[PDB]
């Protein structure tokens, strides 16, 4: 319910979030990963058909995503269950490892390796979405089926339907 915002400083214990964190340079406040998704998908009428715009603009929903990601990067899980409480990110992962039965002393003794592990994995996401064209089949089929049903309705107007002509005027 409250739009949080991350500090401009980026000393996240070596972790790198520049790919998912919003980029101010773009006119729209969307990040490096988000812009490809808007490009991969390939997106008023005559006979009464009309399409209405959504209540939330495409830029507006980008503010929620940044707010959700900003809260979870400094507070963890506490911002969803009451008043937000900040915590260092080098210690938040220590609590997360306690959720899978491994002691917190593993992270602090292997912080450098894990920081590179997570940083390297993030980079592999961007080209995976761009290179393979079968990643967004679920989203691409939503628009295609909706357009297919809308198009075939218009083409049905030319059906004779057992009469001598299809045009309402010449009949």
């Amino acid at each position: 319910k409250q739009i949080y915002k991350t500090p401009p400083i980026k000393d996240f214990g070596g972790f790198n979030f520049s790919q998912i964190l919003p980029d101010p340079s773009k006119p729209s406040k969307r990040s490096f990963i988000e812009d490809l998704l808007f490009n991969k998908v390939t997106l008023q009428k005559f006979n009464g058909l009309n399409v209405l715009p959504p209540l939330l603009t495409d830029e507006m929903i980008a503010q929620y995503t940044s707010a959700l990601l900003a809260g979870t990067i400094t507070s963890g899980w506490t911002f969803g269950a009451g008043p937000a409480l900040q915590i260092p990110f080098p210690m938040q992962m220590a609590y997360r490892f306690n959720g899978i039965g491994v002691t917190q002393n593993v992270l602090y003794e292997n912080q450098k390796l894990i920081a590179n592990q997570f940083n390297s994995a993030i980079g592999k996401i961007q080209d995976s979405l761009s290179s393979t064209p079968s990643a967004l089949g679920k989203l691409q089929d939503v628009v295609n089926q909706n357009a297919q049903a809308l198009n075939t309705l218009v083409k049905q107007l030319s059906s004779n339907f057992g009469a001598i002509s299809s045009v309402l005027n010449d009949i």
Partner: protein
Amino acid sequence: SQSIIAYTMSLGAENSVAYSNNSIAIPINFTISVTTEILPVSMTKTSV
């Protein structure tokens, strides 16, 4: 002077969190709250 007006929707109250690498916020007090929850479970029967 109430009348009909059109404006831009407000997404909420802007709030900033002070982040530091050696700072935490531990609450000292708490509270207990109760909330409602409404779910339909059935619809009226009809036979024709």
